[PDB]
Amino acid sequence: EARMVANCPVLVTGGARRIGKAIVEDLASHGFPVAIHCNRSLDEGEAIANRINDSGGNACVVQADLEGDVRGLVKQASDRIGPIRLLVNNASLFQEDKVGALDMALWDRHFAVHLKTPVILAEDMRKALPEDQDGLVVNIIDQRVWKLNPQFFSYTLSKTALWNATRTLAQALAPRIRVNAIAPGPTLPSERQRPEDFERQVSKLPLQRAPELPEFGRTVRYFWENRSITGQMIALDGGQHLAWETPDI
Ligand SMILES: NC(=O)c1ccc[n+]([C@@H]2O[C@H](COP(=O)([O-])OP(=O)(O)OC[C@H]3O[C@@H](n4cnc5c(N)ncnc54)[C@H](OP(=O)(O)O)[C@@H]3O)[C@@H](O)[C@H]2O)c1
């Protein structure tokens, strides 16, 4: 076989900032060729790619709107670094809505970025990946799919759908492509979160600590390195999904 990292081109969606960037830089530093997909963060993406290449790694930037036609995205990437073998579906939209005031326009976007696009890209990767190569899809989801609540209604349904799809994609794409997932908990402040709000939330986690950014790339590599694993998720969440103390107790 030939599963050495130099022969495992990676596509990370929304890879130019924050968690996506941490994954990109971890994989690139371990010798994976990496395609950094981005949209609004082109400047950042190019900077990351330049640094990797100057350090002797292998990186490129691809640009696409994951709510438009994404049927060309895998090919943009493979044209640069070779057939995509490891797909990280990291890109996301995290907007609040609730029952009683649902806007089907925002609903549609959530399902576009978290469900439609990841499935389409997994489909496209499979079609283009040579038959003598095994592949891996890692979906970046959200710990809340393991502890359902009514907040962020359409967001939550779209992320939970991605977790459901992690199972059914794993079943559909086996044996050649494995599909696993990471469910982050509080990792970086969520735009609507001030630092104090983030720190307080973390202090309330069962483990009282946030996942460290290196854990994300380590987990992608863990899935890559242990070939008996498919259809499964690790919550890098400080135990958030196991929180249990509700007012009724
Ligand atoms: N941060 C946390 O603590 C946390 C907690 C739970 C779950 N998660 C999940 O972990 C993953 C990473 O978190 P994050 O906070 O780092 O994500 P993010 O910053 O909110 O966004 C990541 C990327 O998604 C891309 N994106 C969104 N819509 C796009 C579109 N139509 N077309 C192309 N790109 C689009 C963007 O790329 P461009 O910027 O280039 O446009 C954006 O940079 C996400 O899936 C998130 O849902 C994170």
Coordinates of C-alpha atoms and ligand atoms in Angstrom, one line a residue:
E1 CA 0.0 0.0 0.0
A2 CA 0.9 3.7 0.2
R3 CA -0.7 5.5 3.1
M4 CA 2.3 7.7 3.9
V5 CA 1.4 11.3 4.6
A6 CA 3.0 12.6 1.4
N7 CA 0.5 10.6 -0.5
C8 CA -2.6 11.8 1.5
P9 CA -3.8 15.2 0.1
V10 CA -6.1 17.0 2.5
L11 CA -8.9 19.4 1.9
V12 CA -10.0 21.5 4.9
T13 CA -13.1 23.6 4.4
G14 CA -13.1 27.0 6.1
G15 CA -9.4 26.3 6.8
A16 CA -8.0 29.8 7.0
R17 CA -9.1 30.7 10.6
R18 CA -9.4 29.4 14.1
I19 CA -10.1 25.6 14.4
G20 CA -9.8 25.0 10.6
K21 CA -6.4 26.7 10.6
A22 CA -5.3 24.7 13.6
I23 CA -6.2 21.5 11.7
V24 CA -4.5 22.7 8.5
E25 CA -1.3 23.6 10.2
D26 CA -1.1 20.4 12.2
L27 CA -1.6 18.2 9.2
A28 CA 0.8 20.3 7.0
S29 CA 3.5 20.1 9.7
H30 CA 3.2 16.3 9.8
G31 CA 3.8 16.1 6.1
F32 CA 0.3 16.0 4.6
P33 CA -0.3 18.1 1.4
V34 CA -3.1 20.5 2.4
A35 CA -5.6 22.5 0.4
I36 CA -7.0 25.4 2.4
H37 CA -10.5 26.2 1.3
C38 CA -11.8 29.6 2.2
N39 CA -14.3 32.3 1.1
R40 CA -14.1 35.6 3.0
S41 CA -10.7 34.7 4.5
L42 CA -8.5 34.6 1.3
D43 CA -5.8 36.9 2.7
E44 CA -5.4 34.6 5.8
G45 CA -5.5 31.5 3.7
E46 CA -2.7 32.7 1.4
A47 CA -0.6 33.7 4.3
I48 CA -0.9 30.2 5.9
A49 CA -0.1 28.5 2.6
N50 CA 2.9 30.7 2.0
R51 CA 4.3 29.9 5.5
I52 CA 3.8 26.1 5.0
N53 CA 5.5 26.1 1.6
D54 CA 8.4 28.2 2.8
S55 CA 8.9 25.7 5.7
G56 CA 9.1 22.9 3.1
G57 CA 5.6 21.7 3.4
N58 CA 3.0 21.5 0.6
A59 CA -0.1 23.8 0.6
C60 CA -2.5 25.7 -1.6
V61 CA -5.6 27.9 -1.3
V62 CA -8.9 27.2 -3.0
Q63 CA -11.8 29.6 -3.0
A64 CA -15.5 28.7 -3.1
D65 CA -18.9 29.7 -1.8
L66 CA -20.3 26.6 0.0
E67 CA -23.8 27.8 -0.7
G68 CA -23.3 28.1 -4.4
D69 CA -22.0 25.4 -6.7
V70 CA -19.4 23.4 -4.9
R71 CA -19.2 20.8 -7.6
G72 CA -15.9 22.2 -8.7
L73 CA -14.3 22.5 -5.3
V74 CA -12.7 19.1 -4.9
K75 CA -11.2 19.5 -8.5
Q76 CA -9.8 22.9 -7.7
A77 CA -8.0 21.3 -4.8
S78 CA -6.8 18.1 -6.6
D79 CA -5.6 20.1 -9.5
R80 CA -3.0 21.6 -7.1
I81 CA -2.0 18.8 -4.7
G82 CA -3.4 15.6 -6.1
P83 CA -6.6 13.5 -5.5
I84 CA -8.2 14.5 -2.2
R85 CA -7.9 11.6 0.2
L86 CA -8.7 13.2 3.5
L87 CA -11.7 15.7 3.7
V88 CA -12.3 17.8 6.8
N89 CA -15.8 19.4 6.7
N90 CA -15.1 22.2 9.1
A91 CA -16.9 25.2 7.5
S92 CA -19.9 26.4 9.4
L93 CA -22.5 29.1 10.0
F94 CA -23.6 29.5 13.6
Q95 CA -26.6 31.8 13.7
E96 CA -29.4 31.8 16.3
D97 CA -33.1 31.3 15.7
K98 CA -35.9 29.8 17.6
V99 CA -39.3 28.1 17.2
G100 CA -41.9 30.8 16.9
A101 CA -39.8 33.0 14.7
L102 CA -38.2 30.7 12.1
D103 CA -36.9 32.2 8.9
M104 CA -36.6 29.4 6.3
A105 CA -34.0 31.4 4.5
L106 CA -31.5 31.1 7.4
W107 CA -32.7 27.5 8.0
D108 CA -31.7 26.7 4.4
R109 CA -28.2 28.2 4.8
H110 CA -27.6 26.1 7.9
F111 CA -28.6 22.9 6.1
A112 CA -26.5 24.1 3.0
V113 CA -23.3 24.5 4.9
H114 CA -23.5 21.7 7.5
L115 CA -25.3 19.0 5.5
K116 CA -25.7 19.5 1.8
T117 CA -22.1 20.7 1.1
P118 CA -20.4 18.1 3.3
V119 CA -22.3 15.3 1.7
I120 CA -21.7 16.6 -1.8
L121 CA -18.0 17.0 -1.2
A122 CA -17.7 13.5 0.3
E123 CA -19.5 12.3 -2.8
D124 CA -17.1 14.2 -5.1
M125 CA -14.0 13.0 -3.2
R126 CA -15.1 9.4 -3.5
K127 CA -15.7 9.7 -7.3
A128 CA -12.2 11.3 -7.9
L129 CA -10.1 9.3 -5.4
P130 CA -8.2 6.5 -7.2
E131 CA -9.6 3.0 -6.4
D132 CA -6.3 1.8 -4.9
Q133 CA -6.4 4.5 -2.3
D134 CA -8.5 4.4 0.9
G135 CA -10.0 7.7 2.1
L136 CA -11.3 9.5 5.2
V137 CA -13.9 12.1 5.8
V138 CA -13.9 13.9 9.1
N139 CA -17.0 16.0 9.8
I140 CA -16.7 18.8 12.3
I141 CA -20.0 18.9 14.2
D142 CA -20.9 20.1 17.7
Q143 CA -21.1 18.5 21.1
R144 CA -24.7 19.6 21.4
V145 CA -25.8 16.8 19.0
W146 CA -25.2 14.4 22.0
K147 CA -27.2 16.6 24.4
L148 CA -30.1 18.1 22.5
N149 CA -31.7 21.3 23.7
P150 CA -34.1 23.8 22.0
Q151 CA -31.7 26.7 21.5
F152 CA -30.3 27.6 18.0
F153 CA -33.1 25.6 16.5
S154 CA -32.2 25.3 12.8
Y155 CA -28.5 25.3 13.5
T156 CA -28.9 22.3 15.9
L157 CA -31.1 20.4 13.5
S158 CA -28.5 20.9 10.7
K159 CA -25.6 19.8 12.9
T160 CA -27.5 16.8 14.2
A161 CA -28.2 15.9 10.6
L162 CA -24.5 16.0 9.9
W163 CA -24.0 13.5 12.8
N164 CA -26.8 11.3 11.4
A165 CA -25.1 11.5 8.0
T166 CA -21.8 10.5 9.5
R167 CA -23.3 7.1 10.3
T168 CA -25.2 6.7 7.0
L169 CA -22.3 8.0 4.9
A170 CA -20.0 5.6 6.8
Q171 CA -22.3 2.8 5.9
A172 CA -22.6 3.9 2.3
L173 CA -18.9 4.6 1.6
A174 CA -17.4 1.6 3.4
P175 CA -15.1 -0.2 2.9
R176 CA -12.9 2.3 1.0
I177 CA -13.8 5.5 2.6
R178 CA -14.3 5.9 6.4
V179 CA -16.4 8.7 7.8
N180 CA -15.9 10.0 11.3
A181 CA -16.4 13.2 13.2
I182 CA -15.3 15.6 15.8
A183 CA -17.8 17.3 18.1
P184 CA -16.2 20.4 19.5
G185 CA -17.3 22.0 22.8
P186 CA -16.3 25.5 23.9
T187 CA -13.0 26.0 22.0
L188 CA -12.9 29.6 21.0
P189 CA -15.3 32.4 22.0
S190 CA -18.4 32.3 19.7
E191 CA -18.6 36.0 18.5
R192 CA -21.6 36.6 20.8
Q193 CA -19.4 35.6 23.7
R194 CA -17.2 38.0 25.6
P195 CA -14.1 36.5 27.2
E196 CA -15.6 36.3 30.6
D197 CA -18.6 34.5 29.2
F198 CA -16.3 31.9 27.6
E199 CA -14.2 31.4 30.7
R200 CA -17.3 31.0 32.9
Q201 CA -18.8 28.4 30.5
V202 CA -15.5 26.5 30.5
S203 CA -15.4 26.5 34.3
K204 CA -18.8 24.9 34.3
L205 CA -17.7 22.0 32.1
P206 CA -17.3 18.6 33.8
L207 CA -13.6 18.7 33.0
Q208 CA -13.3 22.4 33.7
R209 CA -11.1 22.9 30.6
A210 CA -11.5 23.6 26.9
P211 CA -10.1 21.4 24.2
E212 CA -6.7 22.7 23.2
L213 CA -6.3 23.4 19.5
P214 CA -3.7 20.7 18.9
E215 CA -6.3 18.1 19.9
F216 CA -8.2 18.7 16.7
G217 CA -5.4 17.8 14.3
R218 CA -4.3 15.0 16.6
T219 CA -7.8 13.6 16.4
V220 CA -7.8 13.8 12.5
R221 CA -4.5 12.0 12.5
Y222 CA -5.8 9.4 15.0
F223 CA -8.7 8.6 12.7
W224 CA -6.3 8.4 9.8
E225 CA -3.9 6.1 11.7
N226 CA -6.4 3.6 13.0
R227 CA -8.1 1.9 10.1
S228 CA -10.8 0.0 12.0
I229 CA -12.7 3.1 12.9
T230 CA -15.7 4.4 11.0
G231 CA -19.1 6.1 11.7
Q232 CA -17.8 7.5 15.0
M233 CA -17.3 10.7 16.8
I234 CA -15.0 12.1 19.5
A235 CA -16.4 15.1 21.4
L236 CA -13.5 17.4 22.2
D237 CA -15.7 19.2 24.6
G238 CA -14.4 19.0 28.2
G239 CA -17.3 16.6 29.0
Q240 CA -19.9 19.2 28.0
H241 CA -22.3 16.6 26.5
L242 CA -22.3 14.7 29.8
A243 CA -23.4 17.7 31.9
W244 CA -26.5 16.6 33.8
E245 CA -27.3 18.9 36.7
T246 CA -30.7 20.4 35.7
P247 CA -33.0 22.4 38.0
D248 CA -35.4 19.6 38.5
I249 CA -32.9 17.5 40.3
Ligands
LIG1 N1 -15.5 27.5 18.0 C1 -16.1 26.6 18.9 O1 -15.9 26.7 20.0 C2 -17.0 25.5 18.3 C3 -17.9 24.9 19.2 C4 -18.7 23.9 18.7 C5 -18.7 23.6 17.3 N2 -17.8 24.2 16.5 C6 -17.7 23.8 15.1 O2 -16.1 23.7 14.7 C7 -16.0 24.0 13.5 C8 -15.0 25.2 13.5 O3 -15.5 26.2 14.4 P1 -15.1 27.8 14.0 O4 -15.7 28.6 15.1 O5 -13.6 27.9 13.8 O6 -16.0 28.0 12.5 P2 -16.2 29.6 11.9 O7 -15.1 30.4 12.4 O8 -17.5 30.1 12.4 O9 -16.2 29.4 10.3 C9 -15.3 28.6 9.7 C10 -15.3 28.8 8.2 O10 -16.5 28.5 7.7 C11 -16.4 29.2 6.3 N3 -17.8 29.3 5.7 C12 -19.0 29.6 6.3 N4 -19.9 29.7 5.3 C13 -19.2 29.5 4.1 C14 -19.6 29.5 2.8 N5 -21.0 29.7 2.3 N6 -18.8 29.3 1.8 C15 -17.4 29.1 2.1 N7 -17.0 29.1 3.4 C16 -17.9 29.3 4.4 C17 -15.9 30.3 6.4 O11 -14.7 30.5 5.5 P3 -14.3 32.0 5.0 O12 -13.9 32.7 6.3 O13 -13.1 31.9 4.1 O14 -15.5 32.7 4.4 C18 -15.4 30.3 7.9 O15 -14.1 30.9 8.0 C19 -17.4 24.5 13.0 O16 -17.9 23.5 12.2 C20 -18.2 24.7 14.3 O17 -19.6 24.6 14.0 C21 -16.9 25.2 17.0

